[PDB]
Symmetry: D2
Subunit: 198 residues, 4 copies
Amino acid sequence: KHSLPDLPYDYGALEPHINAQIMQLHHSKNHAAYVNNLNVTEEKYQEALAKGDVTAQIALQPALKFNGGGHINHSIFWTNLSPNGGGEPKGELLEAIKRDFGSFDKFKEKLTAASVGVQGSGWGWLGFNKERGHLQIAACPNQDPLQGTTGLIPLLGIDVWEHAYYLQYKNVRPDYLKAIWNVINWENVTERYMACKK
Amino acid sequence: KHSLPDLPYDYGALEPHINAQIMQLHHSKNHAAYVNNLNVTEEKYQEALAKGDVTAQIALQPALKFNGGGHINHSIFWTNLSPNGGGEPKGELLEAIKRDFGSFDKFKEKLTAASVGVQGSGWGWLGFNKERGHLQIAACPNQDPLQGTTGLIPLLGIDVWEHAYYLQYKNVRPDYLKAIWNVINWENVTERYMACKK
Amino acid sequence: KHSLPDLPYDYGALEPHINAQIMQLHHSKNHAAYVNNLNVTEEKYQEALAKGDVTAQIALQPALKFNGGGHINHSIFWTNLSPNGGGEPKGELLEAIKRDFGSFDKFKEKLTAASVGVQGSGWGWLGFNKERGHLQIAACPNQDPLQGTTGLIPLLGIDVWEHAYYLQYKNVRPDYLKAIWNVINWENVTERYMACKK
Amino acid sequence: KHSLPDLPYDYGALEPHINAQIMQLHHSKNHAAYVNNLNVTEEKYQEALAKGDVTAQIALQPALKFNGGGHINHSIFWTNLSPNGGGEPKGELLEAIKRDFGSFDKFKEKLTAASVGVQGSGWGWLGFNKERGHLQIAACPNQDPLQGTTGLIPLLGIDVWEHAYYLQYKNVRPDYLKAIWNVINWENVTERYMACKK
Ligand SMILES: [Mn+2]
Ligand SMILES: [Mn+2]
Ligand SMILES: [Mn+2]
Ligand SMILES: [Mn+2]
């Protein structure tokens, strides 16, 4: 059913901002484990649902949210990065950022603060509030996906799990966040943003 | 396909301990609301599981645990009560209570304490730890079902949601728990216990 | 030492929207219990804080958030209602509602859904986002306070705990929600609103 | 005011099980960040507590549980490890384990599963249920302390945050777990255990 998507760039394409070892491991080991367990949990849920086992379906929720979210999160993350990214977004998105956060630098601080703030494992997200018609920064615990738990549309996600920066930046999460702005695929983020107004 | 089970006694069978209006509204309203929304959520889950929409499967979880657990919880509760109940259990159920909690009265206080202790909506439970082979008391938030969220198999449940006592005992929950001991179907919990030892 | 604030109107001043029985018990019993538990909890906290007992401090956390929250929430709640209430706000507040939700009728529908959506015990809130300079609807579980857990400034609160409406509306929360609009002290909300733009 | 307890052995005393860099960074940087943010948080809480600001008290909670728990957890953790440790405990502890888990090798699988099972950041714990006079295995999320959030008295803890192994064992948590059994200070646990039957 579910597959591990190919990275749209090589492992060391985000150097030095994100090394090739973090990239190789994060993709081929972490994301891959998510994709597998998701398939197995999804099939065990199918059997339970068809059998009317409500207890089982409920006992499988944690594994489904974790591995499902893990696959949703990482898939979006790969597309959010790029060796040709960085700088500031172009077009409407940069303008929407001006409205909702004041300026690009203010947006940068806020999302960096939401990411640095995650106590434990989690993600920092720039999303879109469909009901409201504006952008919205949000953080999520462990592998809880943005849309499935808040209804917000993911535009730019920054993984702040220790596995996404420890081998290189160690305990200095702030340095990791500062290095990632250099490899942000703004063309992708503007794609997802434009796809919302639809 | 799930259905609202009938009560093994009529609406005013638990007087004066639990009034007919409570019994009637609890079963015909709350429980009935749980079974329908559960069926709709499952059918909605089959549809998303068929399109591999992980986001949909996850945005459906709260409704499934809430309504599904609501259904599991109350179905057990109904059977746990009886117009011929009260007193104390017999045989090895009583012995497992003495061994695990010291005495019936100690067990009473413990389950009463756990039930009186839920802040907000919840359930106080007496379950069986199949792993360790013994009785264990637990408390659960809202409609979180004992087994699906904790692994313990439910034997005796006590609904401490305000809708299960307010119209009668108002804000004095400990008076409800004092009264509930009189209509406890120990025959049903004994059976529920014995099925764990098989 | 916290004190139970006096009601700014007679226990029956909100009829036939929220019967006098509910208002009497809700204030004199429910709200009273929190105030009292909070005073006992803070007292116990100053003791653990002094001894550097991090364990007791953390152990007292649920009790303080629950009781401290019950007091914060209801204190604001009583000030949100009025015998001379109902209708629609005007000027600065009605304006701000229109920009953030479109119309007053939409604002109502949105706060009504957020409040009805609460599974178990909780509240529906109209708050203000100081960082974003605009309004924002939010839902809080159990007695978790708006400002203390979401960081938003409380503007209008509507208690959806079952004790807040059950005796009059039974299990139909929507009716309670439709009725409560008739006693809203908009004069108070705008003042809370002005304090944010202050 | 709290302080970083001196490690009872040098950073490389747990090699090849736990490398010198993990130990180095873990104690001097991670555990250090906790004691400091705790001292900041407490001071701020005694401040807010003094004014009776229940909002600030509640808003400080996550930071207190997080940092206070981080200080409590790691302080204990350092004692649970020793270069001259490993093997099996003896006397009353081994018997307790045999009785409450079947055998030592069974206890290990159990404490290993709880630890491997935590999704995201957390800890696996072997504790003591003073209420039931027996050993109990619990898992705690993030820095949530055992006794403060569970009541169980801590006997042996296993940090399963990625920073506790990722630098060495990478994505494979099971390896860190197989290895940690080698440097476990079964003399310290026996002491903590004997302190429970006091
Ligand atoms: Mn990751
Ligand atoms: Mn109920
Ligand atoms: Mn209330
Ligand atoms: Mn650690």
